[PDB]
């Protein structure tokens, strides 16, 4: 896979809450995916398996940027005992009037993950309530996304 930037991203299990949380913070030299030399990025994440096809979340759209900043943080309710049958997908995307919106990158955390991707999600679970915060090389090829080029 080719690189496409860096994404930040925040795990936090909460015992209380009963719920993951996911911080989608900010991202770094996405690729740029418009006439101008930029993207208008957002990102989107799903946890799968999706039971019931409830789990998409979406930041803003930050227009002219390669360097956004979103700051948001979503919550997937989920018993701590299922964390480790979950994949959660983040996907990074360029927003286009008049045509499909532009695939930059993402990157799939799980325990069935490599290197980072795998020991974000590992350290996530094993230690509840601590968020565990950290940057990530996005992909070109995210399964069920499109073609690597
Ligand atoms: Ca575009
Ligand atoms: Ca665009």
Same mark, same amino acid.
């Given at each position: 896979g080719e690189e496409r930037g860096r994404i930040l991203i925040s795990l936090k299990y909460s015992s209380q809450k009963q719920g993951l949380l996911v911080g989608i913070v900010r991202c770094a030299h996405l690729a740029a995916m418009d006439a101008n030399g930029?993207? !208008?990025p957002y990102v989107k994440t799903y946890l799968k398996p999706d039971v019931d096809k409830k789990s998409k979340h979406k930041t803003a759209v930050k227009k002219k940027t390669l360097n956004p900043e979103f700051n948001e943080e979503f919550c997937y309710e989920i018993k701590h005992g299922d964390l480790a049958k979950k994949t959660l997908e983040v996907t990074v995307w360029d927003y286009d009037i008049g045509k499909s919106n532009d695939f930059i990158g993402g #990157? #799939?955390? @799980?325990?069935?993950? =490599? @290197?980072?991707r795998l =020991?974000?999600?590992? !350290?996530?679970? =094993?230690? =509840? !309530?601590?968020?565990?915060?950290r940057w990530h090389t996005l992909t070109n090829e995210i399964p069920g996304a499109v073609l690597s080029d």
């Open positions: 930029y993207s !208008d #990157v #799939v955390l @799980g325990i069935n993950a =490599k @290197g980072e =020991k974000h999600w590992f !350290d996530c679970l =094993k230690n =509840k !309530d601590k968020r565990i915060e």
